[model samples]
Target: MNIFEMLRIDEGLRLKIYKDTEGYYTIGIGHLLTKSPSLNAAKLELDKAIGRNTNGVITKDEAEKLFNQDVDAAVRGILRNAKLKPVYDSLDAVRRAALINMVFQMGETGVAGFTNSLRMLQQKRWDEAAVNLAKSRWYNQTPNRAKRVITTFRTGTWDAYK
Candidate 1:
């Protein structure tokens, strides 16, 4: 599967705005409406997409459209990052999707903070990368999802989906 499918699986579909695990205002496949990266920008986009202000109900088509935008932005951000771009380029499609998945959940800066994990991934040191990822706050925050991501990195397979 692609990054979009994985994200849809992980985030699930939410037509109306609600609080996420960390209690931030979120909507439409985990799109954070009240968190950083710019709340105004999010609202501006949401307003246009749903033809209303933030925190309102959206149609399924609108949600998917916004989700595609979010996923594309995540991919672009990951590729544009100097520290992550090279490592990201070195990975296969599945592993690249895993990395993008991380960036999708946490912002690029958050994922970039995993220096050790990124280094291991750059070198194709799967076990080391997984170990480093498992030792993070992100892991503790969502163990089930984190474990699936770690396994994707470690095995370079779509085992997590199965």
Candidate 2:
């Protein structure tokens, strides 16, 4: 179960209090909870998850451990719709992991929006799939980071940079 922690780190990782996908409080590697360090929600939830702290701060070591647990489960348990499940299941280890990497940032529902890219992936049109992936607003939003993943998926050669 190889994991790319930096992939999600590029997508999300804020030391300050913030809101997560479901609008829950998040900090230290997108770890989500019901309360926020911003509101001074007492940060009780963070304390429960991380540990008691005068500030919302945490060590990189502490963050990595929590990050590993959260992402390992999430990637393993990713739920694709029936349309995409078979396609997802058929990906190679590298490509499958790539999907999980993108899935973390894009989310299941969000990736589903990549209808053509997924179809191209299923048909083994690697380059087309990559193009479809990049021909989107997401590509523009995080051009460098998205291009890294997109290029790797297109070609087996992985480049952490574009």
Candidate 3:
């Protein structure tokens, strides 16, 4: 699957504001209102996206729009990072999507913290990179997602969706 499709499935969608696994107030395909650049602006956008004051549901178009915005931010964050850019550029599409997914779940700084893993990825050591990913607290917190992403790095294939 493509990056956006993979992310949509991985992150899931919620129309109204709801607590995420970490209890953050999230909406619109994992958009964290709490972490939004501007809380008031985000709320206003939500209102506009929903096509009303507060419908407690987001339109599909609006959700996709929000998703695209988030993906762009994550992509830019990954590319702008000196440590991750090269490693990210070295990978294939599937593997690149995996990195984007990491940035989506945990900010660029969080993904950058994987020094050993990034080095392994930079060297094209797929299995070692996967191992490094498994060693993270991120893995401990979300074993299922970690396993899928690790498999992507290990195999360089789209079978992670299966």
Candidate 4:
């Protein structure tokens, strides 16, 4: 099954899944508020937090207050559109997911700056792509995470960290 299927995400849980996972929160993606206090509160609090985190588009504190799975689903819907399919085709499922996560966090312009890496990949220049991937500020900021994802794209194996 695909990653979304593995996450057992439905419309209601999609946005919440993106929020919880992307934010690095410890709460389960779709737990009911009544059953999971933290998760419930995060859901309730998200509206206010999304704006802060998203620079007026979303606030972290508000998103924490009202997290839902639907947001992630909506994001996935946008990414899965036919027009976007080709842009993501160069990477494997895991790398594609990670790329989407990065885009979701950084916006289109930020993600679009990976032009050198994309060109390298299109030309099958694996080493060049990896090097180009490492040159970004995003790489310096996230370190291992970016390396691991880009390495997965380059080699089709999780051996970069080893």
Query: Which candidate leads in lDDT?
Result: 1
Clashes of each: 0, 0, 0, 39
Q: How would you order the candidates by TM-score, starting with the best?
A: 1, 3, 2, 4
Give the Å shift of residue 137 in candidate 4.
0.7
Highest TM-score among the candidates is held by which one?
A: 1
- Per-model TM values vs. the true structure: 0.90, 0.73, 0.87, 0.50
Error of 2 at 144 (Å): 0.4
Model 4: CA > 4 A from native? 1-45, 48-84, 158-162
lDDT of 2 at 117: 89
Ten-residue region with minimum lDDT total, candidate 3: 33-42
Regions of candidate 1 where Cα sits further than 4 Å from its true position: 36-45, 53-55
Per-residue accuracy of model 2 over 1-162 as CA lDDT, tens digit each: 244545554646666666765466766676665644455673766677776673666677776667787777556546536655766787787677677777766667788778888889888899888878888988987788788778768875555642
Q: Which ranges in model 2 have alpha carbons more than 4 Å from their true place?
A: 5-26, 30-45, 51-54, 79-84
What C-alpha root-mean-square deviation, in Å, does candidate 1 show against the real structure?
2.9
Model 3 residue runs over 4 Å out of place are: 35-52
Give the range of the ten consecutive residues with the poorest summed lDDT in model 1. 36-45
Residue range 55-141, candidate 3, lDDT tens digits? 445777777888898899999998899988998899888889999999998999999899999899888998878888898789998
**RMSD, one per candidate, in order:** 2.9, 4.0, 3.1, 9.8
Error of 3 at 8 (Å): 1.2
Q: Model 4: per-residue lDDT, tens digit, 21-138?
A: 2343332333222324454455444433343433213334333344345336435653665434455776666556545545544555676667777677666687888888888887
As for TM-score, the candidate ahead, 2 or 4, is 2
- Would you list the clashing residue pairs of candidate 2? none
Compared with the true structure, all predictions reach lDDT values of: 0.86, 0.69, 0.83, 0.51
